């Protein structure tokens, strides 16, 4: 499960995978508790929408979702696709994810105003248009 | 104090001031409690750094600081200065904050990829280079 996911996104820490997995479990548990609130509770609609909007802002949900959609759409992979080298590859800035890891590690890459040299940096939706070369 | 902060920064509700004031008190209480952990406690060091990094990323802190600086540098006004109208005025994009409020509410302003029409929106450090006309 992991080694495949870690393979397709060129993740070398087994620990990165376990953090993303716990976050998926966190979101699941949070949606379950929200769904167990009284449906007459205005807190439930509001905090369900807070969680949805947050996952949009992270780019973890790329499509309009309901709370029931979260089991399908919220996966370790959806988080992995947010890592800076995978983003770079999708933007065509690097031929391969492995080349993007090297570009990032060697200091060639900037997101917004910041030099990022950590390939585990997750690119939010606000930032995904602002990946640039330092050169 | 509430009335004067609102006037300086053209805030039209009384509640944004209290939101910012509680946040300033959250930061002070958090910094006091961190200082009560042992100086050698790695948790304290990690969480002091995270807190400093967060206030830098918000632009609330504009200069390299330490936890002992938080008492002074973290004010309601330092938060107010992050509101989109104030940021625009400081960038010279509007002659006045009131002008900026209008540009914003009328849909003329984008921050990063998003149209922002709420003058209470806070511009993080990441976003402040990316306020553009529509």
């Amino acid at each position: 499960r992991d080694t495949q996911v870690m393979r397709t996104y060129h993740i070398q820490n087994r620990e990165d995978y376990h953090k993303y997995n716990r976050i998926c479990g966190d979101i699941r548990r949070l949606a379950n508790k929200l769904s167990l609130l009284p449906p007459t509770d205005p807190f439930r609609r509001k905090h369900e929408q807070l969680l949805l909007d947050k996952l949009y802002a992270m780019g973890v949900l790329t499509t309009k979702s309901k709370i029931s959609d979260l089991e399908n759409k919220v996966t370790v992979s959806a988080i992995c696709r947010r890592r800076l080298p995978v983003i770079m590859h999708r933007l065509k800035m690097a031929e391969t994810i492995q080349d993007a890891v090297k570009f990032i590690e060697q200091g060639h890459v900037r997101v917004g105003p910041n030099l990022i040299n950590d390939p585990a940096y997750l690119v939010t939706r606000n930032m995904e248009d602002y990946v640039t070369w330092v050169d | 104090r509430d009335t004067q902060v609102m006037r300086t920064y053209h805030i039209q509700n009384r509640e944004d001031y209290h939101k910012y004031n509680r946040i300033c008190g959250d930061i002070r209480r958090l910094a006091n409690k961190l200082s009560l952990l042992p100086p050698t406690d790695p948790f304290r060091r990690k969480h002091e750094q995270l807190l400093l990094d967060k206030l830098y990323a918000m632009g609330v802190l504009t200069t390299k600081s330490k936890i002992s600086d938080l008492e002074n540098k973290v004010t309601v006004s330092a938060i107010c200065r992050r509101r989109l109208p104030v940021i625009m005025h400081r960038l010279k994009m509007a002659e006045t904050i009131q002008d900026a409020v209008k540009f914003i509410e009328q849909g003329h302003v984008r921050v990063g990829p998003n149209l922002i029409n709420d003058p209470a929106y806070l511009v993080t450090r990441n976003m402040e280079d990316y306020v553009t006309w529509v």
Partner: peptide
Amino acid sequence: GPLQKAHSEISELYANLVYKLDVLSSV
């Protein structure tokens, strides 16, 4: 009472989630 406790539990879990994602997308 029970409703406030249910709300507080959700607020702590969501804040913790916001915190975890924030650490991953910040320098």
